[PDB]
Structure formats: C-alpha cells, structure tokens
Design a protein around this nucleic acid. Structure first.
Ligand SMILES: [K+]
Ligand SMILES: [K+]
Ligand SMILES: [K+]
Ligand SMILES: [K+]
Ligand SMILES: [K+]
Ligand SMILES: [K+]
Ligand SMILES: [K+]
Ligand SMILES: [K+]
Ligand SMILES: [K+]
Ligand SMILES: [K+]
Ligand SMILES: [K+]
Ligand SMILES: [K+]
Ligand SMILES: [K+]
Ligand SMILES: [K+]
Ligand SMILES: [K+]
Ligand SMILES: [K+]
Ligand SMILES: [K+]
Ligand SMILES: [K+]
Ligand SMILES: [K+]
Ligand SMILES: [K+]
Ligand SMILES: [K+]
Ligand SMILES: [K+]
Ligand SMILES: [K+]
Ligand SMILES: [K+]
Ligand SMILES: [Mg+2]
Ligand SMILES: [Mg+2]
Ligand SMILES: [Mg+2]
Ligand SMILES: [Mg+2]
Ligand SMILES: [Mg+2]
Ligand SMILES: [Mg+2]
Ligand SMILES: [Mg+2]
Ligand SMILES: [Mg+2]
Ligand SMILES: [Mg+2]
Ligand SMILES: [Mg+2]
Ligand SMILES: [Mg+2]
Ligand SMILES: [Mg+2]
Ligand SMILES: [Mg+2]
Ligand SMILES: [Mg+2]
Ligand SMILES: [Mg+2]
Ligand SMILES: [Mg+2]
Ligand SMILES: [Mg+2]
Ligand SMILES: [Mg+2]
Ligand SMILES: [Mg+2]
Ligand SMILES: [Mg+2]
Ligand SMILES: [Mg+2]
Ligand SMILES: [Mg+2]
Ligand SMILES: [Mg+2]
Ligand SMILES: [Mg+2]
Ligand SMILES: [Mg+2]
Ligand SMILES: [Mg+2]
Ligand SMILES: [Mg+2]
Ligand SMILES: [Mg+2]
Ligand SMILES: [Mg+2]
Ligand SMILES: [Mg+2]
Ligand SMILES: [Mg+2]
Ligand SMILES: [Mg+2]
Ligand SMILES: [Mg+2]
Ligand SMILES: [Mg+2]
Ligand SMILES: [Mg+2]
Ligand SMILES: [Mg+2]
Ligand SMILES: [Mg+2]
Ligand SMILES: [Mg+2]
Ligand SMILES: [Mg+2]
Ligand SMILES: [Mg+2]
Ligand SMILES: [Mg+2]
Ligand SMILES: [Mg+2]
Ligand SMILES: [Mg+2]
Ligand SMILES: [Mg+2]
Ligand SMILES: [Mg+2]
Ligand SMILES: [Mg+2]
Ligand SMILES: [Mg+2]
Ligand SMILES: [Mg+2]
Ligand SMILES: [Mg+2]
Ligand SMILES: [Mg+2]
Ligand SMILES: [Mg+2]
Ligand SMILES: [Mg+2]
Ligand SMILES: [Mg+2]
Ligand SMILES: [Mg+2]
Ligand SMILES: [Mg+2]
Ligand SMILES: [Mg+2]
Ligand SMILES: [Mg+2]
Ligand SMILES: [Mg+2]
Ligand SMILES: [Mg+2]
Ligand SMILES: [Mg+2]
Ligand SMILES: [Mg+2]
Ligand SMILES: [Mg+2]
Ligand SMILES: [Mg+2]
Ligand SMILES: [Mg+2]
Ligand SMILES: [Mg+2]
Ligand SMILES: [Mg+2]
Ligand SMILES: [Mg+2]
Lengths: 209, 56, 123, 61, 118, 114
RNA sequence: GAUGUCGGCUCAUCACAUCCUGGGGCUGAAGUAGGUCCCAAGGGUAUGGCUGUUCGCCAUUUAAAGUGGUACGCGAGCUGGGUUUAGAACGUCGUGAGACAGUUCGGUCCCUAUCUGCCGUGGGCGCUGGAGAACUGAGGGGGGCUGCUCCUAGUACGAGAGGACCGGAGUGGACGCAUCACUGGUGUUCGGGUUGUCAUGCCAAUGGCACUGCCCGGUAGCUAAAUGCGGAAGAGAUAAGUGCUGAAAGCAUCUAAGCACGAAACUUGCCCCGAGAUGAGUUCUCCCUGACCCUUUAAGGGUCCUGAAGGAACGUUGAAGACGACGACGUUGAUAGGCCGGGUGUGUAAGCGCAGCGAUGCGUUGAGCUAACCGGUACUAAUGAACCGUGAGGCUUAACCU
RNA sequence: AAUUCCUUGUCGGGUAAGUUCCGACCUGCACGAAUGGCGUAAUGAUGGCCAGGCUGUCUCCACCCGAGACUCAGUGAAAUU
RNA sequence: CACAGGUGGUCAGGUAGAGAAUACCAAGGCGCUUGAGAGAACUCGGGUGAAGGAACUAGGCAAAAUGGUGCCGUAACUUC
RNA sequence: AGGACCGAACCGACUAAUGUUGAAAAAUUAGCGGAUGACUUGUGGCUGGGGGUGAAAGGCCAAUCAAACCGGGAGAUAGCU
C-alpha cells in the first residue's frame, strides 16, 4: 500500500488501563493531495506524487506554481512519490487522509536523522578508546592502525574512519500503530522515529510483516 | 612527513585555482545622500536607508 | 547491575555475609546481572557455624540492586544495597531457610517460588 | 619462544619445545638449546624417562 | 554539537564574559550609542534590554537588582530615572544595531549599537 | 506544542493531592498476582518531586525490614491508585537526597505545623 | 650513505585445512548423545589467576571459545614489561682487563602528510536554449549470530533409565540503527547554602577573587546504563547428497536423451547511496517570438535595443554545519533578538512589622529570581534597488501532418 | 637464595584460579665466614607480595569549562626534493 | 632572540593565619606586541559522572582519597 | 642536645604528563627529597692535559672528555668509498 507524509510533532506517553506506559511518537499527518499520477505508458512505472502542508505564495516559484496548477491543488511544502501496487489507483487532485492507516498494525517510518556533524571514530563507529593512562601519548581517541604492512600497501575501501555522521535518510521498520486520530490528523506510533521535532516523515505500511 | 619529489608549477597553480578573490557583487545607493555603500551597512557619511544615523 | 568483582550482601541465613560475583551466567560476553538473574559467586565472609564456608563457589540469584528494577509504567524501585540469595550449583534451589529484607515481583516464577514465599515483603 | 630470549633471532624463533602425553597428562619441556631439534630430542628423552619412572613408581608401590 | 544552545562564548571564560558585558552595558547606558564588534553588539542586546525592562518598574528591590547586574549607581540612576520612563510604552527592542564596516586593525566586522529613541 | 499538550491533558489525573518534599505519604498501588488484583501500600518520605505535567513523578523513601527502599512513582500512572499525605514535613530543599546517608534519629524531619 | 624487534593495545583484512550455527553419507547410528567423512566461509567465535611473555596450566563461562596468511598484519597509530648501550651486584669463568642462549635492581620511543590510499565535504565544466522539481535504477555498500523455556509430548524410541525428528510460540545474550517519552549523567549560561578577604561612605543588601572558592539542587541540549526497532519469511538457480524414468550393456543403472528435490553459501527479497550510468536516462512545469551592420561569409563577428524563468549576492538565521554545502525567512514578515503570558528549576527575595538580650525565628509569602523550553506579539534588525543569467535554441535521415 | 640449570622443584599458606609472594625442605648446576657469615630495632623518592580506603585505571564511556585545531584580516618558516 | 631559564645583597603594610605558607588587599606596578569570529573530529589543561570498584596494567601508572588543633587511645618488635 | 622531627626561603631532582623543526641545545606543570648541617651561598685565590680534581659515575676540567682547546709537523697515512 502507499504511504503518507507527516511531521514529527514530538514524543508522548500513553497510559493503558492495565498500568503500562507506551512511549509514542506523534506524527501530524494532514491531508496529502495527489499532484501527479505516473503510469507505464507515459513514465514506465506506476506511482503517485503527493504534496502536503502549505507554502508561501511569494516563495513558490513559477515552475512549481505551474506544476501545482496543472493538478489543481494548493501548493504544499514539498513533493514525494509513492509506488503503486497493481490494485491501487488514484486520480490527480484526490486527497488522502490519515484514515488510510485505520487498519494497519505496523508501519515503517523514514526520516532524516539528526545531524551530529564531523564525528570521530569512537562516536561514529563505536571504536574503543585506547588507554587513558599508562604512558599513552596523544592517542586516547585516535583510530589506531588503518591497515597492514607492505601487503597490501594501501587502505581498503569502506574503512571505518571519522567523518560526517547523521543528517541522512534513516528508516525504522515495524513500529506499532498505537492510535489513528482522523479528526486531529494524528498518528501515534510506538517508539522513536528518525529526525528532530518538526521534520518530515514518510510513513508506509510495514514491508516485513 | 615531507615530499619525496618537488611539486611542479603546474600543480601549484592547480592548487591555487580556488584562491581567487570575489569582488563585491554590487553597491547599494543611499536614497537620500546618493552615496554608494555596502548593502545593509551605513554610508561613509553616516547615512543608512536615507536617515542620518550617526552625526559626523 | 552486577558484574564480576561486585561484592554483594546475602539476604538469607545460609551463613554467608559477603559474596563476590565471579561470573554473570547466561550468555557469551554477558555484562550485567539484574534482579532475578543467576550469578556464580565465591564466599568472602561467613559466620562460624553456617551451612557454607568461606571460599566456596556456588550460585546465587540477585534479589536487590542499587540500580533497581523498572516497572511497565516507568516506575523504578531502588534499594540501598546489592543483595543475593545463595543457591546450590546443581539444583539451584535456595540454601538457607529464611529470607531477610524485601524482594521484588521479578522473582515471581516457578524457579524462585521458595524465595517469594519466604520473603518478608514483596514489592 | 623461549623465556628471556635475547636478540632478534631468539625473540623470533620458536625453539622451546613442550611434549604432553595425552593418556597420562605428564608434560616435559626443554629450551636449553638454540636448536628446536635438539630441544625436541631432549624433551623426548625426558618424556621416556618420566614414563619409565611412572612405571617404576607403580612397581615400587 | 550545540543544538538549541544559546550564548556566544566569544573566546573568553564565563567570568570574563560577564564582566565585559557589565562594562559594555554601563557604557551603552551612559553614552546611548557605542561602536563595538557585531557579535558583541548582538550579545549585548540580551544583557542591556532586560536591564531597561527591569528599570520600567521603580522599586528598591529593582534598584538593588539593577545594581547587582551593573555595579554602578550612576547607571542604575540613569536607568530608573530616564530610560524606564523613556521606554515605558515600548514593548521591547530598546536598541538598534547598524553595521558600519570593518575594523582597520584586524578586519573585524563592526557595528554601532544605540538606544532607539536617541 | 498544542497537540502534545492536548494529548497529555486528556490523560492527566484530576485529584492528585498537594504534597511537598519531606511529607510522609502513603501510596496505594495496584498489585496484580495471577488473576487477583489488590492494593499494596508504600508509605514513606517524599524526597523528590519532578513536576512535568503528564510526566510528573515523585520519589518516596522508606526503611522496609531493615533495608532502605526508594520507589519512583509516575504521578498520573493508572497503577498509582491513591496518594494520601499522612504527615507534613518541614524542610528547606526541593530534593532531600541527603537523607540517604542518615538513619534513625539523624533522619528525623520536623513537622510543618501550619 | 639504516627495511626499527617480542608481547600487549587500537584497527583490521583475506584463506579454508569449518570451532558453532546450516545441509548431507556411513556408523560397532534404538532414542538422547556421539564417531567419521563430504558440502558449506553468511554471521558468530569468553572473562579472569600466574608470568614481559608467546605458549601453557588453572578457575568459571559459552552455541562455539577454529586453524592460518597478511614484513609471524599493524611503533611517520599507542605502549615499552621482555629484549638491546652506558650504573651496580650475585653465581660462575679468567692472574687480570673483563665475560656468561646465567641471573638481578635502574635506565630519553622524533617527525606540522607532498604523493598514492582511505573517510567526509566543496568548487568547475559537461550532459547541446535556459531553468525549477520529481524520478528511474546501471551499479555500489550495509545487514545476515545465537541461547533458554513452553506446546507438540513424557509422544516416537527404549526392558528401564532416559527421551526425540518435523512443526509452533515466547523470552533472552551479543551486535547494529534510531530516539530522549521515561529512568539517569552532564548541565563553569538558572536558584540556593556557606568559608576567608576586599570593595560599593556606613547599616542593611550586593558584587569581585579564592579550581565554577567550596558545595547542594537543576532547564534546554547532548547523552546510556534508558527504550523502540532489526537480523527474517518468501522466490530463483545450486553444492554434497537423494531420486524417477531410462538405454549404451535383452539385466542393472540418478544420466548418456528427459524429469524432480536439495543448505546460514550464490541471485533476489530488507535498508542506504546512486544518471560524471560521458551509455550523463525519464516525467512534469516555467521562461525568452527586436532591429541593424560588416568580414575571410560561417554552428562568423559585431552594433544597438532587450535582461525573462531562475540564480546568486546581502541580511535575520537553523536540533544544518570545520569552511563550503543544506534548510527557513526578508515588511504582502514570526527568521533572530526583545517583550508578554505560561512552564520549569531553586526554595518563602528584598523592604517592613512582630517576638527575642542576641544569634535567629515568625508574618507579609510557595515569596523572589528563573538559560537554551512552550504559546503569542512587528518593539528592533531583516531596504527600494543593483548583479548574473537572454532574445525561440545545429546538421543528416526517417515518420507524420504537410 | 640479588646465587637453583633442571624448575612453574616438592609440601604448606594466601586466591575461584598464584611461573610472583610468604614458611619449610636440601637434590647447594655453581652459599659460606672481614673481595666477611648469619641476625638485626630504626631509617629508605630502594626491589617483590598482600589488605582496607579511594577512585573514569577499567566494564564503557557521556557531558561540560578553557587553550589549540577550523574561517577571516596581517606577518610569515622548516625538514625534503 | 624584546627567549616561560639563570642571577648576590637590602626593605618587609592590613585581615585571617604558627608562619617570609596560603587567600584577599594597601603603597606601587602591570594585562605578558598579532587580533576578530566560530563553537566539528582530534590534541592539551581542567570539572562532574548511574551501577560496579583494580575486573586496568609489566606495575594502582595516573587519578581519587587522607590532611588542622585539642583530648581519649594506640600492637609486634626494640639497640629502651 | 641532636649529620633529631614537621614545614617555607634556599639547595636538590624521585614519578607522570607536556614539549621533542621546543618558550628552553635538558625546561614547564602537578606532586617529590633535604632544609643547624658531611648544609647552602657571594667575592677572590690555587691545582693544567697522560696532567688536574673525583664521598668513584671514567665523573668533571667553558653546551668539548677512555685523554680539553688553539696553532704547528701537515697536503700524517688511507691495499678503502
Ligand atoms: K594589524
Ligand atoms: K556443522
Ligand atoms: K553425521
Ligand atoms: K563461515
Ligand atoms: K613458557
Ligand atoms: K587473523
Ligand atoms: K618486518
Ligand atoms: K612506515
Ligand atoms: K605516489
Ligand atoms: K532524557
Ligand atoms: K537533562
Ligand atoms: K563576599
Ligand atoms: K531405475
Ligand atoms: K542526468
Ligand atoms: K520572537
Ligand atoms: K521570612
Ligand atoms: K521577606
Ligand atoms: K516559584
Ligand atoms: K649458586
Ligand atoms: K679482599
Ligand atoms: K658484622
Ligand atoms: K621495604
Ligand atoms: K595570594
Ligand atoms: K692529553
Ligand atoms: Mg547538528
Ligand atoms: Mg614524550
Ligand atoms: Mg594524554
Ligand atoms: Mg600495487
Ligand atoms: Mg587554497
Ligand atoms: Mg648474549
Ligand atoms: Mg535557538
Ligand atoms: Mg583567538
Ligand atoms: Mg571565578
Ligand atoms: Mg637511502
Ligand atoms: Mg570444505
Ligand atoms: Mg563470499
Ligand atoms: Mg544471501
Ligand atoms: Mg589466558
Ligand atoms: Mg601479573
Ligand atoms: Mg611465515
Ligand atoms: Mg600475528
Ligand atoms: Mg610482526
Ligand atoms: Mg608502520
Ligand atoms: Mg625495559
Ligand atoms: Mg656495566
Ligand atoms: Mg628510577
Ligand atoms: Mg611515537
Ligand atoms: Mg557538510
Ligand atoms: Mg555485502
Ligand atoms: Mg524533553
Ligand atoms: Mg537529574
Ligand atoms: Mg553541577
Ligand atoms: Mg551561583
Ligand atoms: Mg555588612
Ligand atoms: Mg579585586
Ligand atoms: Mg588578586
Ligand atoms: Mg532398464
Ligand atoms: Mg539465522
Ligand atoms: Mg515550581
Ligand atoms: Mg541572597
Ligand atoms: Mg603452592
Ligand atoms: Mg590481586
Ligand atoms: Mg620461599
Ligand atoms: Mg659471596
Ligand atoms: Mg675472605
Ligand atoms: Mg656486607
Ligand atoms: Mg637519603
Ligand atoms: Mg591567515
Ligand atoms: Mg614580548
Ligand atoms: Mg627573560
Ligand atoms: Mg572545545
Ligand atoms: Mg579532555
Ligand atoms: Mg575529578
Ligand atoms: Mg562513577
Ligand atoms: Mg555513586
Ligand atoms: Mg568499595
Ligand atoms: Mg589484574
Ligand atoms: Mg586483563
Ligand atoms: Mg601515584
Ligand atoms: Mg589529587
Ligand atoms: Mg634534620
Ligand atoms: Mg622537612
Ligand atoms: Mg640562587
Ligand atoms: Mg647532583
Ligand atoms: Mg617542581
Ligand atoms: Mg626525613
Ligand atoms: Mg664502567
Ligand atoms: Mg662540559
Ligand atoms: Mg693519547
Ligand atoms: Mg711529515
Ligand atoms: Mg689529507
């Protein structure tokens, strides 16, 4: 099934009547409007493009404005695509609400994880720090060795080194759908999802199941 | 660590290919005094956006 | 949160006063043992006429920790000391006949029913 | 490697020999000589002597 | 990482920062316009403007608090006698910053910061 | 934001009594064993209160059978059936963590007699 | 005219002669549990006592604690216990200086990375008019572990003792990803206590300095010990192996023709990168429809006029960030500060009154203060402009209108 | 044994586990009496071993405060080739 | 070298303090001849740290800890 | 009284880190030892190279020591590069 685009509102807890606290992430899933439908004849694959939210009229460029006007929908804050199974069918301008998840038990949530900046090997790859005492010289958090001797005489590709960490697309799979509140456009899922507060999330039905 | 071979003037120029300065794109003209100034900065005469902000 | 070299008090009357964890049983590279976990202990101090002697190696079940246990609603129960109950190497049944101090609900299993029954108070 | 090995050669070479008799568990070991072959021969002689001495101890008992 | 943090370190320790901003607040109150670096002016906003908001209400406790923040009775008196009444109706933003080029000695970005009713 | 605040308001309890650190309180909590469900009382001194709306909590310390036991209750948890203040204590701190090093007479807390 | 060395540490990478998990054959395989060989390298594959140790023995675990290569991998990554200078001593040898694959105590480990390599992050041009988006997926990378309990079932098997295959469920260990609702850490930017001293004329109240003077709490953020999730199922083709039909060879025969099964290995399935994929792809949308002059006369050069879509620059900035970059916003505005209200933390300010000889207590009072939080609010700063980017986009051949 | 090769000798103590330590034994490779023998209170920035306390030494690292590293302006090296 | 070194004698305020220690000050003298930003890894110098508490390592290296005055009390052994 | 005790100046230099093209051709920081003595320090003097001096390390004798430095023999010699 297709997914929806939402916004990470924050984290809450749900107290069940049997004394269990469920940590939930709240995703504000407002209506997603279909701005384009792609098919085999014209595009070679079946997918729907959707938008959500609102945008400044003076910050929507003319190409974007024309693309939205052809669909007949208000300009959203972005465009996302969802592949279609052979049974699913939508029409341009159709609106999809969080009611789509009314009978879904588990979802996959994809978002851009928090950015940690240039991170060291200890933080990025869980390398073990060397000794803090016992004569260690300026080598407390350094990587250590990065290869063998003359053979091969090089460093292998994919070597774990320090560098940019976070700020990348991350998918968390098989999160329970705690609650679907259609009137408040809310999806309460169990657990933590990637991204900071106010970030865009893509919620799909769980692919593993 | 130090070079095993002396780098060339070609390689030196290639490295310095990114060292070029960028001139200021354009100067703003004050609506009252007509003086040119950096955008969002006061003029040399103490004007900003047509108003005499600092005397002298 | 008990690991190797951790000193624990004894919550029963087996005769031991201080024991030391020498292995957290139940998995390769396993680090910590919480309440309801079985550890291998050596006896560091014992009373003169006890059922166990200093230097013995046997098992024990951790019944109280300073780190504490966490309940499903987020609550946490903490104690002021780490205390365990001694157990045979083979049967893993309690050695003593009395249990001292409170224990937690985490022992509510068919394996530790004797401890649950003998405990003065279950939290 | 033998204990207290002095020099690159000795630090690198595997000269010390230890022989364990699986049925009995008796172990002999020799590292006096530079040559692993000489050490192995001496350890074999000591192992033979120890097995014979074990049998002799049984006979004496 | 400094996610959601606030406050510029300005390559100083905490006590030096506090003393420098106390002095700079005193100078700004005294002269009503000063020339500093742009980061220092942007940080001085968050020190000076609460002082004027405090001075809006005149009481012994507020005067003592203003003295503690800015240890000079001249600055305290000027605050509570002129700047409070001057800025009584104004909600906030008692200061404005005008970027004014670069310092000759070290090419530091410079800015005037002044009281808005000066 | 407003959304999370609404989601928490519709869950918060309404009859939580006022208590301050140093008060002796009895907390009756639901204990479920097998199929029978009863109430167990935990009585002791409140040494810490964390006011966080729905996420509010409080720590109660007692001396049970010769051992010191601290329990951190989530205030709006359904498992906390009831809270009652048995005695009002007179302290000057928000967190009475120094009581962990005191026993017997040294751990006495003066009563707030008003 | 110098290739630093044992062990350890950090980080590894490959082989298979496989230690565990997977599949099989035979068994002197009843079951359980083994033995032995064959296939299989996806993942996994201890912590301590002694010793400089490698090794080894020992203790206690584990599904298992594999064997190897990599300058016996790795000192321009660390160490420096061993070894390996100069001091000293013992045993022993020598008349002696001295010496010992004898021992003992002590004894400087440099290098700012040019190139390749690797981890990240940009600029340029290209992709054939320019531009803004959304994609496709050639290709590449990640991941791949396993215990225990229960049901099947005390069933099959067994004289008993004991005790399954196959299949199903639950709950753990280690590892990884994310996140901060909780539990905590931190929190020299918030509150308080207090010691010495100095200053604000003094009292009172504050400030400075003493590691934040010492402490006790603690917001936001970051974070683990905290809590969510993952390894799969399925599919294809197979390995060892098992077969069906089947002659050569009237029988037999898994094979020669033909057909079917068969594993953590392979190709997918899951996650991420990904059109510089120069083989530069696709889709949607937006913009530009002037004149004139020369030459060597063409994908030629000018001249004037025109300057679009969009971009960049500048400014306010950001859970974005070394700098770039990326995101939000620029008055038709909540981007930042301030302000307002709330929350949170601290714990009842000051001043005044009362009680007390006084320290101090009580009342005003849950008071006062309150960072990064939440909800609002144009008070301040985000200026009109200017800048770059053009003027309908080559040839040939097809198909269609023409 | 600052001396013992065999050797991690053997036995005892300490430890869950002790090639080190302490007490013995004597089979002294290769102790020994002023190149002194064996004791020895006190002393030692002396060697070895053990315990309590204490702890980021470690399980296993996290956050914070400063000085660098990074960017801008000015001045402006070096080995090596 | 306008160099975190070396360099003999004399003078000796206040408060606390045994003190020429140490903290804060007086008289007096200085802010150390590159600055401005930012708030990555990593290095250095510090602060704090749940549970554990030497498991680290050649070795408790380093750190943490102890720390004053008065009084009580104090073992083997000893050359008393 | 004391080659007595604690501890500044003073004299030293046991541990670690930093620094190692250093702030420094031996230091800084935190600790550490002695601190009325075989103590420490100023000024001047004396001992000279196979010589001095040495509570002895082949230590020291002007950043030089199993034989100082300067000049000379001297273009020593070099079956070696
Ligand atoms: K200058
Ligand atoms: K196998
Ligand atoms: K088999
Ligand atoms: K394998
Ligand atoms: K050995
Ligand atoms: K290997
Ligand atoms: K080598
Ligand atoms: K090298
Ligand atoms: K090269
Ligand atoms: K948290
Ligand atoms: K926090
Ligand atoms: K004070
Ligand atoms: K057949
Ligand atoms: K392209
Ligand atoms: K605002
Ligand atoms: K009061
Ligand atoms: K008051
Ligand atoms: K309050
Ligand atoms: K000897
Ligand atoms: K003699
Ligand atoms: K004698
Ligand atoms: K000693
Ligand atoms: K001082
Ligand atoms: K001489
Ligand atoms: Mg970030
Ligand atoms: Mg060094
Ligand atoms: Mg270091
Ligand atoms: Mg090669
Ligand atoms: Mg450059
Ligand atoms: Mg030799
Ligand atoms: Mg902010
Ligand atoms: Mg600076
Ligand atoms: Mg200070
Ligand atoms: Mg060479
Ligand atoms: Mg094989
Ligand atoms: Mg492979
Ligand atoms: Mg596979
Ligand atoms: Mg081992
Ligand atoms: Mg050892
Ligand atoms: Mg080899
Ligand atoms: Mg190796
Ligand atoms: Mg090697
Ligand atoms: Mg190397
Ligand atoms: Mg050494
Ligand atoms: Mg010698
Ligand atoms: Mg030494
Ligand atoms: Mg090095
Ligand atoms: Mg970046
Ligand atoms: Mg792979
Ligand atoms: Mg929060
Ligand atoms: Mg806390
Ligand atoms: Mg703190
Ligand atoms: Mg404070
Ligand atoms: Mg006073
Ligand atoms: Mg002062
Ligand atoms: Mg001072
Ligand atoms: Mg046939
Ligand atoms: Mg598996
Ligand atoms: Mg409050
Ligand atoms: Mg106060
Ligand atoms: Mg023994
Ligand atoms: Mg030990
Ligand atoms: Mg002995
Ligand atoms: Mg002798
Ligand atoms: Mg003699
Ligand atoms: Mg003698
Ligand atoms: Mg001495
Ligand atoms: Mg520069
Ligand atoms: Mg200078
Ligand atoms: Mg000087
Ligand atoms: Mg920093
Ligand atoms: Mg540090
Ligand atoms: Mg500390
Ligand atoms: Mg700790
Ligand atoms: Mg603690
Ligand atoms: Mg302890
Ligand atoms: Mg150890
Ligand atoms: Mg170890
Ligand atoms: Mg030490
Ligand atoms: Mg210390
Ligand atoms: Mg003396
Ligand atoms: Mg002394
Ligand atoms: Mg001197
Ligand atoms: Mg000396
Ligand atoms: Mg010193
Ligand atoms: Mg002494
Ligand atoms: Mg000598
Ligand atoms: Mg000299
Ligand atoms: Mg001579
Ligand atoms: Mg001659
Ligand atoms: Mg010559």
């Amino acid at each position: 099934m297709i997914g929806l685009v939402g916004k990470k509102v924050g984290m809450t807890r749900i107290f069940t009547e049997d004394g269990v606290s469920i940590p939930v992430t709240v995703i504000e899933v407002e209506a997603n409007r279909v701005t384009q439908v792609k098919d085999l004849a014209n595009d070679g694959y079946r997918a729907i493009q959707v938008t959500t939210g609102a945008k400044k009229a003076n910050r929507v460029t003319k190409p974007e404005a024309g693309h939205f006007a052809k669909a007949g929908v208000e300009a959203g804050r972005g465009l996302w695509e969802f592949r279609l199974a052979e049974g699913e069918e939508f029409t341009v301008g159709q609106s999809i609400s969080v009611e789509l998840f009314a009978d879904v038990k588990k979802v996959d949530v994809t978002g851009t994880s928090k950015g940690k900046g240039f991170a060291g090997t200890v933080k990025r790859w869980n390398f073990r720090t060397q000794d803090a005492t016992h004569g260690n010289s300026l080598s407390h958090r350094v990587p250590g060795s990065i290869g063998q001797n003359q053979t091969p005489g090089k460093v292998f590709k994919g070597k774990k080194m320090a560098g940019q960490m976070g700020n990348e697309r991350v998918t968390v799979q098989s999160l329970d759908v705690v609650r679907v509140d259609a009137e408040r456009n809310l999806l309460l899922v169990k657990g933590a999802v990637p991204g900071a507060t106010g970030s865009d999330l893509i919620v799909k039905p769980a692919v593993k199941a | 660590a130090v070079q095993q071979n002396k780098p060339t003037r070609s390689k030196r120029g290639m490295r310095r290919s990114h060292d070029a300065l960028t001139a200021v794109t354009s100067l703003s003209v004050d609506k009252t005094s007509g003086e040119k100034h950096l955008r969002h900065h006061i003029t040399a005469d103490g004007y900003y956006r047509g108003r005499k902000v600092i005397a002298k | 949160m008990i690991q190797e070299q951790t000193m624990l008090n004894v919550a029963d009357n087996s005769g031991a006063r201080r024991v030391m964890c020498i292995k957290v049983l139940g998995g390769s590279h396993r680090r910590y043992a919480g309440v309801g976990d079985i550890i291998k202990i050596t006896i560091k101090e014992a009373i003169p006429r006890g059922k166990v002697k200093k230097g013995d190696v046997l098992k024990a079940v951790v019944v109280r920790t300073k780190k504490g246990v966490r309940r499903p609603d987020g609550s946490v129960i903490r104690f002021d000391g780490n205390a365990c109950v001694l157990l045979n190497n083979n049967s893993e049944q309690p050695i003593g006949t009395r249990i001292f101090g409170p224990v937690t609900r985490e022992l509510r299993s068919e394996k530790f029913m004797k401890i649950i029954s003998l405990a003065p108070e279950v939290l | 490697r033998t204990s207290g090995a002095g020099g690159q050669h000795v630090n690198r070479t595997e000269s010390a020999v230890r022989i364990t008799h699986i049925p009995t568990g008796i172990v002999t070991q020799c590292q006096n000589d530079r040559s692993q072959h000489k050490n192995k021969d001496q350890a074999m002689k000591q192992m033979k002597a120890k097995l014979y001495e074990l049998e002799m101890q049984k006979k004496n008992a | 990482m400094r996610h959601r943090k606030s406050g510029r370190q300005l390559n100083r320790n905490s006590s030096h920062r506090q003393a420098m901003f106390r002095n700079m607040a005193g100078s700004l109150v005294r002269h009503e316009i000063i020339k500093t670096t742009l980061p220092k002016a942007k940080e001085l906003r968050r020190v000076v403007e609460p002082l004027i908001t405090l001075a809006k209400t005149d009481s012994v406790a507020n005067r003592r608090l203003a003295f503690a923040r800015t240890r000079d009775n001249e600055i305290v008196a000027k605050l509570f006698n002129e700047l409070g009444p001057r800025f009584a109706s104004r909600a906030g933003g008692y200061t404005r910053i005008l970027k004014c080029g670069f310092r000759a000695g070290d090419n530091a970005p410079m800015a005037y910061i002044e009281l808005v009713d000066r | 934001s407003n959304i999370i605040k609404q989601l928490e308001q519709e869950q918060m309890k309404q009859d939580v009594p006022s208590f301050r650190p140093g008060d002796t309180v009895e907390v009756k909590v639901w204990v479920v064993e097998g199929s029978k469900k009863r109430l167990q009382a935990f009585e002791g001194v409140v040494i810490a209160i964390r006011n966080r709306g729905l996420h509010s909590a409080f720590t109660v310390r007692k001396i049970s059978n010769g051992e010191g036991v601290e329990r951190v209750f989530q205030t709006h948890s359904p498992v906390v059936d009831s809270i009652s203040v048995k005695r009002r204590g007179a302290v000057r701190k928000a967190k009475l963590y120094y009581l962990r090093e005191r026993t017997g007479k040294a751990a006495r807390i003066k009563e707030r007699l008003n």
